[PDB]
Ligand binder design. Structure first.
Ligand SMILES: Nc1nc(=O)c2cc(CCCCc3ccc(C(=O)N[C@@H](CCC(=O)O)C(=O)O)cc3)sc2[nH]1
Ligand SMILES: NCC(=O)N[C@@H]1O[C@H](COP(=O)([O-])[O-])[C@@H](O)[C@H]1O
Length: 200
C-alpha cells in the first residue's frame, strides 16, 4: 500500500513510520511527505530518507476546501492508498475526509475519548489523571471521533509537565502508529461497512 504522511513540525512519528515501513515485511511504503508549514524538522527527516516532499501552505488558499484540494491533487499524483496524519495540526474538510474514509489515520496523544483537541497533555495534567496514553484512529469528520485502531496507556508521574509527559507518551506513539499502519496496509484491519472496526 502506498502511503502519504502529513506533518506540521518535528516529525518524530514520521521517523518511526519511515523506519517501520523499510522493514522487509512492511506492507506499507511511504511515497510522499506533505507539510503545511515550511522549514520544519520533519522535512529534513524525509529528505534524509530519500522521500519526496511537498509544502502546501494553507495561508495562500481562500478556504479550507481548496487547501485540501491542493493536498488531494498531490495524493493523486503519487497514487496514494493511505494517508497518515503525523503531528499534522490542521483540521480537514468534510469532502476530503469522506473521500479518504477508511484510508486515513491519525495519532492523538490521549486515550480517546478523553481529552480531544490540540492540547491533550495540558488537559490530562489539569484533570489529574494518573493514566493517559495515545490513540491511533481512522479520521472521521468530527475531530478525534473516528474509529479507534490501537491505543497504549502511559503513566502520569507526580510533577509531570507537558514536556516530560509528552516525551513519555511519544515513546508509545512510536510503537502504535507503525503497528496501526501495518494493520491497515496489510488489510488486516479495515473500517467496516457498518462504520465499526473490522478485523479480517
Ligand atoms: N476532520 C478532521 N477530523 C479529525 O479527526 C482530524 C484530526 C486531525 C489531526 C489533528 C487533530 C488535533 C487538532 C485539533 C484542532 C486543531 C486546530 O487548531 N484547528 C483549527 C484549524 C486548524 C488550525 O488553524 O490549527 C481550528 O479549528 O481552530 C489542530 C489539531 S485533522 C482532522 N480533521
Ligand atoms: N493530534 C494532535 C496532537 O497533539 N498531535 C501530537 O503532535 C505530536 C507530533 O510529534 P512529531 O511531530 O514528533 O510526530 C505527537 O505527539 C502527536 O500525538
Amino acid at each position: 500500500a502506498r502511503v502519504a504522511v502529513l506533518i506540521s513540525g518535528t516529525g518524530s512519528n514520521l521517523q518511526a513510520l519511515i523506519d517501520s515501513t523499510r522493514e522487509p515485511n512492511s506492507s506499507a511504503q511511504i511515497d510522499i511527505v506533505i507539510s503545511n508549514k515550511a522549514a520544519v524538522a520533519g522535512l529534513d527527516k524525509a529528505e534524509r530518507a530519500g522521500i519526496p516532499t511537498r509544502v502546501i501552505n494553507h495561508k495562500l488558499y481562500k478556504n479550507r476546501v481548496e487547501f485540501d484540494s491542493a493536498i488531494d491533487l498531490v495524493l493523486e499524483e503519487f497514487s496514494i492508498d493511505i494517508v497518515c496524519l503525523a503531528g499534522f495540526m490542521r483540521i480537514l474538510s468534510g469532502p476530503f475526509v469522506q473521500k479518504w474514509n477508511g484510508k486515513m489515520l491519525n495519532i492523538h496523544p490521549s486515550l480517546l475519548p478523553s481529552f480531544k483537541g490540540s492540547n491533550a497533555h495540558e488537559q490530562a495534567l489539569e484533570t489529574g489523571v494518573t493514566v493517559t496514553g495515545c490513540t491511533v484512529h481512522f479520521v472521521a469528520e468530527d475531530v478525534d471521533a473516528g474509529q479507534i485502531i490501537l491505543q497504549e496507556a502511559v503513566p502520569v508521574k507526580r510533577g509531570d509537565t507537558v514536556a516530560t509527559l509528552s516525551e513519555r507518551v511519544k515513546l508509545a506513539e512510536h510503537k502504535i502508529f507503525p503497528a496501526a499502519l501495518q494493520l491497515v496496509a496489510s488489510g488486516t484491519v479495515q473500517l467496516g461497512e457498518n462504520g465499526k472496526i473490522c478485523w479480517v
